[PDB]
Design a protein around this ligand. Structure first.
Ligand code: CH
Ligand code: CH
Ligand code: CH
Ligand code: CH
Lengths: 251, 251, 251, 251
């Protein structure tokens, strides 16, 4: 199967749907559910969440599923086995707190040349790839050979939606990373492509991405963009009892 | 083989024995030995004990066996790999302190969808399944396909026996959990049944259980209920030397 | 092959050598090298040492070998994975400090019923088997089916030699355990024999052992008892530099 | 294939190149890159670095490669799993900080008799083999059967180059071990040779090494010694941000 990997930038709303491949899985990440339409459908092969809000994002996802807004087969935490990027006890006990989820590093680390590439740049030059590229890496590790990209805009406004929602702002007041650049993401993608002999495509002709990655081919494809109503557009916050039970794992 | 899983509620004494299956193993738990008759015989396939009194329950079980009151092939601790529910060093060193026993989580965790179901409810909603359901899970993990239930009454008086015995009261003065409900147990059982394609039966027509789980079929079976005399009806307490050697493991 | 397992009691000097089996390996332990003659030859299949003096005993053994007093194929520490009986970092780093040696528990624990038997008696009743029985257990785990016993006297004077030597007394001033008894050793041996279908023999008709274990059969065997001269009859003490490097591992 | 293992002593500059074998890999270590000519070419099968400057040496190596001064297939840290010789968290997290590298002990420890030999001498007699011998051990573990030695001079002036360079002096001011001797290296090499049935050769007829190890045979071989210009002849120092991220791993 093919894969569409979506970041949450403005180009998520500017997909050229006639370039949509035949037979695909969808990878979403982070606040993807804040989208106001189902730009890539309700069905995800995998959804990825950062370690720092994983506890709350997992709780929110269970509501999304139960409420029939999305489904996903896989749930991933985008970790790296780096003490400066994630809580150590969180990673150690992960599978026992979230038994239907996965640590993304289980897959990321299978791409040894890329793990080395990522680590050398992060540790020594403070150049960090974004979640969108992380997802590409995990996809290549899972055996996907053709990867279709959208919503990756290099922070050139910020998101395809308003992320300033009250719960998210309470959890992470900063929503109102400096190691990210377009160059670091572009160079990382080019490395994955050549190193692992896979094909990258761009679904958004008007993204800055299209300056670097060739467009997916026109296939006359159609796609219905289902609207969303009374939907979940903020992260949910667990009870204090929940927090008390998870407190060894957050900091 | 089939399995009879027994909680210790009043319905343990109200089994309809003509509904007893042909060829069965018996699972018992906790203060089962306080029973005044051998409601399900002397022979257990497995006995389960909570982490919090496992040290004393293991010592007591060895007396039960030696004194020929019961036998059991397997000895299980009902743990979950959750820091808020069990002592970490207890679980880490378990097999070296109790080499003929098992951590139940070795089996529980093999039912990944159920481990996820249990964890999500416990951590986020403080809804906890009881030992009776835990035992069903372990049985399904061990390959049992037909499960016959008794002694599960949802705390609607408390036990099929008087648990206010002097040693148990000293160990756990509270015998004179608020996350338990009938709904949480019923919903967990229904989940196991549908998810793992197994069959649940109820041996006690007069239990509240029979409102939800269909009765085991009449088979004209007979069963002798052997009386108990001068039997062990309280937990035994180990010496202070024993405690001193186990003290890293209790709290 | 058969095995002769030797404790260091006075009966080590009272072996009936015409009862010596044809084709045997020898297991020695602890201060065996204090013997004044080669009562069982120079060649050991295995030598066992307690965790508490293992650092010094290992150093001493290397001198014994280099000086051509003994040889041994295997070197074992008699541990149990019990925090009250051995240092935890010693066991954790063992194979990296002593790469040609073995932790005896790697073998002991393969006899699950016996590990359980040992643990229940030690932890709950403070009844501990001696090194002589430990060695029998390790031998059964290694596949030996016929075990010939000597030097096991149940502390009924103390050793086949004078152990009051200056270095050993400095290391362990106490040489001038209360959980040991003849009953605990006899009951443990009887358990191994019946449980693992092996055969125990006694080489010393005049030991208290012969009250309980049948004598090995007369085979007309001969054996030369080589005398010892200018031999190593005290434990050696490592330099302070050595100690400083091992100090995380002793206490 | 054959292997040339090079220490960094003065004899590195006094190789008899007509004795160079046909088909070889090269092992280099530590400050090898300070060499003023490519005495053994630009291409390394493996380069080895001590744990204590590994962070900075790894960063430097990436510059060497990128700048096309050397290449190497393998990157090794020469560790021993000894708390007195390396940082414990460094070794524990190694593969996640340096995913394209190897801990040399993964290979060293496969030579069990030699690991035992090394450990007994280091721990008890403070006799330590040098990196040059460590590399021979790792080569034998990797299946190399014929080993050609150079640059091993036993500190009889110090290096084939001036190591007093400003960054290295800042990192390790001491460059302006007392457990090393020629005897300890010679005895360790003789042990490897006899124990593992491999062949040692010496490429430097004028080294003290040639007193002990027979010369590699004349094969009329030719070799071009490529000069070096504007090359990297000091270790590079990472930013404070880099250090802050690695600080749990250095001390
Ligand atoms: N303005 C944007 C916002 C997000 N993205 C991508 O979408 C991913 C999800 O957004 P976030 O900020 O949650 O990481 C992000 O990691 C980038 O890969 C982007 O490329 N440009
Ligand atoms: N009144 C009762 C008492 C016990 N039970 C069940 O029997 C199990 C053993 O009793 P206990 O309180 O030890 O957990 C308990 O976990 C329940 O599953 C019950 O269902 N109703
Ligand atoms: N008087 C004695 C002395 C030693 N032993 C045995 O020899 C073993 C070695 O002696 P020791 O005290 O070092 O454990 C000891 O563990 C016993 O098994 C004995 O049986 N009777
Ligand atoms: N004067 C010298 C310098 C280095 N060496 C060898 O080269 C190796 C690399 O040098 P160094 O000091 O970095 O360890 C060293 O471990 C020795 O094996 C040597 O043999 N004689």
């Amino acid at each position: 199967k093919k894969v569409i990997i979506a970041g949450n930038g403005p180009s998520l709303k500017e997909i050229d749907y006639s370039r949509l491949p035949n037979d695909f899985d969808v990878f979403r990440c982070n606040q993807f559910y804040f989208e106001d339409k189902y730009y890539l459908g309700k069905k995800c092969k995998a959804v990825f969440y950062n370690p720092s809000l994983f506890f709350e994002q997992y709780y929110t996802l269970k509501h999304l599923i139960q409420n029939q807004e999305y489904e996903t087969e896989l749930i991933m935490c985008s970790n790296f086995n780096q003490a400066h990027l994630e809580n150590e006890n969180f990673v150690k006990t992960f599978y026992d707190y979230f038994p239907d989820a996965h640590l993304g590093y289980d897959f990321f680390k299978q791409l040894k040349d890329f793990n080395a590439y990522f680590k050398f740049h992060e540790i020594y030059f403070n150049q960090r790839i974004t979640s969108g590229v992380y997802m590409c890496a995990v996809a290549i590790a899972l055996g996907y050979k053709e990867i279709y990209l959208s919503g990756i805009d290099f922070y050139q406004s910020s998101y395809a939606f308003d992320t300033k929602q009250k719960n998210l702002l309470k959890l992470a007041p900063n929503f109102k990373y400096i190691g990210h650049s377009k160059n670091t993401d572009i160079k990382a993608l080019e490395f994955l492509e050549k190193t692992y002999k896979i094909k990258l495509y761009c679904l958004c002709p008007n993204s800055l991405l299209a300056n670097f990655i060739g467009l997916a081919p026109n296939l006359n494809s159609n796609f219905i963009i289902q609207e969303k109503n009374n939907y979940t557009k903020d992260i949910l916050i667990p009870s204090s009892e929940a927090y008390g039970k998870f407190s060894k794992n957050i900091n």
